[PDB]
Every structure is written in C-alpha cells, then in structure tokens.
Amino acid sequence: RSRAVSAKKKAILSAALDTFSQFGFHGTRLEQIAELAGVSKTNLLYYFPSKEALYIAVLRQILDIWLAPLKAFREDFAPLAAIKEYIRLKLEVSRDYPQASRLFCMEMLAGAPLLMDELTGDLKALIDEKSALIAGWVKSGKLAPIDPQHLIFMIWASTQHYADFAPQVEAVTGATLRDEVFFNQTVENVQRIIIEGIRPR
Amino acid sequence: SAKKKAILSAALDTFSQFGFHGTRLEQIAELAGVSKTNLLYYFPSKEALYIAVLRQILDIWLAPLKAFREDFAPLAAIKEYIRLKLEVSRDYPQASRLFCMEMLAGAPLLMDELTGDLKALIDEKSALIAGWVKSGKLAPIDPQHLIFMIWASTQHYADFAPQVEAVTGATLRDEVFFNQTVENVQRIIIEGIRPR
Ligand SMILES: O=c1cc[nH]c(=O)[nH]1
Ligand SMILES: O=c1cc[nH]c(=O)[nH]1
C-alpha cells in the first residue's frame, strides 16, 4: 500500500543485485549492500531478515519482471501477437538488467540451492496453467502443434542468451544489445524464427 | 596421453564443481593418479589447463558445424546439428556448465579463443548459410542469430537442468523427455527457417 516503503525496498533490492553480481553470495556482506543502498544495516534487516532472505528476494524480483507478460496471457489473446510481445519484452530485460540474468544463471549452475522451492512451487504452478492455455490454442488451430513447455523454454533460452553469453556474442558480432541497431536485428530474428516455427499451417 | 585424458577429465570435474580460483592443481593430480610435476609437464599452469578443458568442449560442440558444406541439404544439416547438440547436453552437462560459468565471468581466460578461432569459424559458416538464404533454400534470416538460437536452446537443457526438472519432472537422461526435446527444438527452428 505504501509507496515510500515500496521505494525503499526497491533501493535495497537494486543494491543487493549489484553487489551479489560483483562479489557472489558467500563473498557479499550485508554491510556492503546497506552502504551501497544508503541504509543502515538494521533498516535492511527489518525488510530482509538474513542474507539468504535477501538473495531469494532478488531472485524472486527477477522472476517477477521476467514472468509478467506470461502471467498476463489469457485464452482470449491473439497468440502470435502475444508471443511476439513476450519475446521483445524478454530481450529488453536482457538489454537493461543483464546483471540480473547472470545472477539467476549462476544460481541455476549451482543446482538452485536457495531457489529450488520457488521453482517447484509457484513457477511450476504458473507454467502448468499457461501450458494448458497454450495447448488450447493448439487445439483451436491458432498455433501449430508444439509442446508448450518447450516453446516456453526456447523463449527463455534464446532471449537470456544475449545477456548470459554477451562476451561470445560480442566476440562473434562486434555488438551488444546496447547497440540499438543490433538490438533491433536480434528482436527481428528471434521473433521470426520462433513465430514462423509455431504459426499454424 | 591416457594420462593426458585422465588429467583433463579430473580437471573438468574439479573446475566444474569448485571454480577456477577454488581448484588446486594438487587435487586434480591426485584424482588423475599423477604427480603434480607430471601434470605440469602437460599443462604448465592452472590457466593452461582450464583453457584446455574449455577448448575440448568447444571442439565437441563445433564438430558438426565445422562439417557444414555448401552442397549439403540445409534444413537436414541444421536438423542433425540440433540433435547432436542435444546429445552433448545430455552426455557432457558438466562441460556445458563450466563453459557457461566462464561466460558469466566475462570470459576472462577464454576471450582470445572467442575473438580468434571461433570468430573465424563463425564468419566462414555464416557466409555459407547466407548463401543458402540468398539461394532461397532458407527463409530470410541472419545466420549468426540462427546459430545463437541453436546454441542457446540446446545448452539450456544442461545449464538450466534444475529448472527444467522442477517444471517438467524430467531431465535429458530420461529417454522419453530427450526424444520430446529433440522433436520440439527441431520443429520450432526448422519450421521457423523453412522457405515459404
Ligand atoms: O523468463 C524466465 C522465467 C523463469 N526462468 C527463466 O529462466 N526465465
Ligand atoms: O556450440 C557452441 C559453440 C560455441 N559456443 C557455444 O556457446 N556453443
């Protein structure tokens, strides 16, 4: 309900993200996050009672940003338009918050020791629901027959790649997503491949 | 050489678990059944050994793409590449994860391999695939992005295995799920690049 409280939380989460990125979970101290955020350590602990709780909150915030378009899917949407928009929003996040994408990737590489409950609970429940929705679209003949979970994974993988594998992308192409021309070429290619791959025939 | 393979295999398992800075050459030598002196004969530094491990997964990954020739059937060639890449994610997930960790770090040790030999290969094979596009044997796509989608989509199933399992109950070590994954990744990419 409180905007001032919400802003303070965001400031702490933003400092935590940037710190957990430069130094890792075990290397990060709460005193470093508080200092970067301009808050007392006691104020930080009021909101996030441990380093573990704060780290999980940073990762839940990235999931929130990433999943917002998919959560919004309704049976009523134009499927190919909705999926196009989803791919574009995902690439914008890789362009704008690459450090979040990398932190999430690092937690996955570690076997999701702190995030596993969020994956098996709330994420699984969401993907189950939207998979049924997408399957309805297939039944209706609005999409070619594909397994929805694999479509979803393809979208995640293809768009996150440009953040997580940025040094390789740059080595190969000379560009990153912060080059506006390259950004646009990327969107156009990822969208064409996925959309023409699921368009009904 | 059987010794060199033992050292590389021990190194992969150790690095992929503990990271570069956390790994000791004494641990790798012990696992490989060699002295640290004998290890250093083959690999004169931890950096050299790490780079060797990462060049080996590059070699395995790139073999199908290196084989591409102008006169191949393009959709068939790409379809086969996707399958072979998923076989690698099933069989060598630790190597995929180690390579991903090196990328997340900004490729501090691997960057020269990426800007040198990798770039040269991708330039040659991008020209080849662009010739296929020019000829109307593929849809109007940009080859580098098609290549990146293949790498991303196939490597995802190793690198993000915890999430794939949390969501689906499966991994690529489950035969039904592996077959399903190949079928679906192939269908999306191949139908997305088929000329219309
Ligand atoms: O967009 C998403 C959502 C969940 N997990 C991912 O890897 N990406
Ligand atoms: O298959 C490959 C080859 C190079 N780099 C990757 O990420 N994947």
Side-chain angles (χ1 to χ4, degrees), chain A residues 2 4-21 23-28 30 32-34 36-74 76-105 107-201, chain B residues 1-4 6-23 25 27-69 71-100 102-133 135-196:
Chain A
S2 166
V5 173
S6 181
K8 162 64 64 71
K9 294 179 186 175
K10 289 179 202 153
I12 294 168
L13 291 162
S14 176
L17 164 59
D18 291 356
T19 302
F20 283 133
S21 177
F23 297 112
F25 178 79
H26 296 291
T28 286
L30 294 178
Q32 297 175 276
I33 297 174
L36 183 57
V39 304
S40 69
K41 186 176 172 185
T42 58
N43 190 212
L44 180 158
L45 291 165
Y46 175 82
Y47 293 110
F48 305 100
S50 64
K51 192 166 71 185
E52 171 171 328
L54 182 50
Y55 181 80
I56 294 169
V58 168
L59 292 176
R60 285 198 291 223
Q61 177 190 51
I62 314 160
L63 283 163
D64 285 342
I65 293 159
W66 279 335
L67 291 164
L70 180 61
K71 286 175 184 174
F73 277 23
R74 298 193 172 273
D76 195 56
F77 277 13
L80 299 171
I83 291 166
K84 283 174 64 178
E85 179 186 20
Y86 183 28
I87 293 167
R88 176 178 291 279
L89 289 172
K90 285 283 285 156
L91 287 164
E92 290 173 8
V93 180
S94 291
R95 177 190 62 204
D96 293 338
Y97 300 106
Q99 68 268 33
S101 194
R102 296 187 324 254
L103 189 68
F104 190 90
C105 188
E107 171 66 15
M108 294 300 102
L109 300 176
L114 288 179
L115 210 62
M116 187 62 76
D117 286 358
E118 175 68 36
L119 309 177
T120 58
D122 283 352
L123 179 66
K124 181 182 198 311
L126 177 63
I127 304 310
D128 284 343
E129 174 192 16
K130 305 302 178 183
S131 292
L133 189 159
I134 294 167
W137 289 333
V138 175
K139 179 181 192 299
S140 292
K142 296 174 185 171
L143 292 178
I146 69 266
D147 176 76
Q149 290 161 342
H150 293 294
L151 167 59
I152 290 165
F153 297 155
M154 166 68 84
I155 296 162
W156 298 350
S158 71
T159 63
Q160 288 155 231
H161 185 82
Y162 288 89
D164 300 348
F165 285 71
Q168 187 171 250
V169 171
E170 188 178 21
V172 168
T173 70
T176 75
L177 295 179
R178 296 201 157 127
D179 176 306
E180 204 245 20
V181 171
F182 185 72
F183 182 88
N184 187 63
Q185 293 164 348
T186 301
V187 179
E188 292 286 356
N189 274 278
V190 174
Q191 289 177 339
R192 187 260 156 62
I193 299 168
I194 293 176
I195 297 301
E196 298 308 323
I198 67 180
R199 180 188 300 283
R201 306 285 168 187
Chain B
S1 183
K3 269 178 180 165
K4 210 183 180 177
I7 292 166
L8 285 161
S9 178
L12 168 55
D13 294 354
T14 301
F15 284 132
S16 78
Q17 276 292 155
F18 293 117
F20 181 80
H21 297 293
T23 286
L25 295 179
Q27 298 169 331
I28 297 174
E30 184 177 5
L31 292 166
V34 304
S35 70
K36 187 177 175 184
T37 297
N38 193 351
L39 180 155
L40 290 164
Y41 166 74
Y42 291 111
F43 307 98
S45 66
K46 194 168 68 186
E47 297 80 347
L49 177 51
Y50 183 80
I51 293 170
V53 167
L54 291 174
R55 283 198 292 219
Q56 184 169 77
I57 194 61
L58 281 165
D59 283 343
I60 296 160
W61 278 338
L62 290 165
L65 179 63
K66 289 174 183 175
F68 276 24
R69 299 292 182 270
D71 62 357
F72 276 12
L75 298 170
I78 292 165
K79 195 173 149 174
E80 178 189 29
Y81 180 31
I82 289 166
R83 177 177 52 85
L84 293 170
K85 282 279 288 156
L86 285 162
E87 290 175 6
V88 180
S89 291
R90 178 190 62 205
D91 294 338
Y92 301 102
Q94 67 274 17
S96 190
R97 296 184 324 252
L98 184 66
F99 189 91
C100 187
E102 175 63 16
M103 290 307 105
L104 303 179
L109 290 177
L110 207 63
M111 190 62 80
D112 287 353
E113 301 296 323
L114 309 177
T115 61
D117 283 352
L118 181 66
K119 160 88 169 143
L121 175 66
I122 305 307
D123 285 346
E124 172 190 18
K125 308 300 179 182
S126 290
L128 190 162
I129 299 165
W132 294 339
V133 177
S135 292
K137 300 171 184 174
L138 294 177
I141 54 79
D142 298 302
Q144 294 157 329
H145 295 285
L146 167 63
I147 290 164
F148 302 155
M149 285 192 70
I150 295 164
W151 294 355
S153 295
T154 64
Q155 292 155 227
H156 186 81
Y157 291 91
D159 302 345
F160 285 69
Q163 183 175 70
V164 166
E165 190 172 9
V167 168
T168 71
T171 80
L172 292 182
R173 295 205 152 123
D174 301 311
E175 193 155 21
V176 172
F177 184 75
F178 178 82
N179 294 333
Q180 190 186 96
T181 298
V182 176
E183 294 180 8
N184 278 278
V185 175
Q186 291 175 333
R187 185 262 152 71
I188 295 169
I189 294 172
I190 293 305
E191 299 304 328
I193 70 180
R194 180 187 301 280
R196 299 290 171 187

